[PDB]
Design a binder for this molecule. Structure first.
Ligand code: IS4
Length: 264
């Protein structure tokens, strides 16, 4: 899957994310692509290739698809499916869309399907949040899995020394013991559902990062967004059981989401 750079036309810049700048391009004249320029020093060529292999081997309609790489050059390019509506957090905050509640549940279903697939491969995300989901031209939400173990947590999200975690997306056992597991991805998925139904509000907005960490241990939970029915809130709230082993799996969550979608 090495791509000839002569088959790529760069159109314009999209922004900067994990591992570097992203541009909108065309591949072979007819395919929309995203092209990310791997920042020098973020990973070596061999480390990049190993991260790309992980991405290629994970295949699902709701995971952003790898198309190819350009490694005979610096910087390295990675070429993926183009997500024209960009990051989910920014998309939710764009009021021009006038989201219906059915559309919001469909976004949750999209991500839940991706996460059910990753769960079936025992693959952990560890930073699931609206800022790490993408939206295509059709409004479908997908997750990029590229290099997740190498993600850098920005200062906005952390409150610790040494071991870091995204405080407002983390269950009590991560906040206290840095104990990540499938069940911490479940917790974060619930927070993502809350972000979707709140149209991109920040979780726990009245508390600092350190206060949030303390208060979660002491039972703080996110309230029901106005756009979420009680049935939808039951689903996100099930992700937040104190005891990790009492939280559902992604397969159970998907079944619950489909049930509510059918009823509502
Ligand atoms: C809200 C977060 C934010 O502001 N971001 C993150 C997303 C990027 C940018 C938006 C437009 N589309 C896009 C794509 C894409 N595939 O269309 C990517 C992207 C992401 C990754 O890994 C995270 C990789 Br690998 C890509 O390889 C080509 C492409 N990023 N965006 C703007 C800033």
């Amino acid at each position: 899957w090495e791509i000839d750079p002569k088959d790529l036309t760069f159109l314009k810049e999209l922004g900067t994310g994990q591992f570097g700048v992203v541009k909108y391009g065309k591949w072979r004249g007819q395919y929309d692509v995203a092209i990310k320029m791997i920042k020098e020093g973020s990973m070596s060529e061999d480390e990049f290739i190993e991260e790309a292999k992980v991405m290629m081997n994970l295949s699902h309609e709701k995971l952003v698809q790898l198309y190819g790489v350009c490694t005979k050059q610096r910087p390295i390019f990675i070429i993926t499916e183009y997500m024209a509506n960009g990051c989910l957090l920014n998309y939710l905050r764009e009021m021009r869309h006038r989201f219906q509640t059915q559309q919001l549940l469909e976004m949750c279903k999209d991500v839940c399907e991706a996460m059910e697939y990753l769960e079936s491969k025992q693959f952990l995300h560890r930073d699931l949040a609206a800022r790490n989901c993408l939206v295509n031209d059709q409004g479908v939400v997908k997750v990029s899995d590229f290099g997740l173990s190498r993600y850098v947590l920005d200062d906005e999200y952390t409150s610790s020394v040494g071991s870091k975690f995204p405080v407002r997306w983390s269950p009590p056992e991560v906040l206290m013991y840095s104990k990540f597991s499938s069940k911490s991805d479940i917790w974060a998925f619930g927070v993502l559902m809350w972000e979707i139904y709140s149209l991109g509000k920040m979780p726990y907005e009245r508390f600092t990062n350190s206060e949030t960490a303390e208060h979660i241990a002491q039972g703080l939970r996110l309230y029901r967004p106005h756009l979420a029915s009680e049935k939808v809130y039951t689903i996100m709230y099930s992700c937040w059981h104190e005891k990790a082993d009492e939280r559902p799996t992604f397969k159970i969550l998907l079944s619950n989401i489909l049930d509510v979608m059918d009823e509502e």
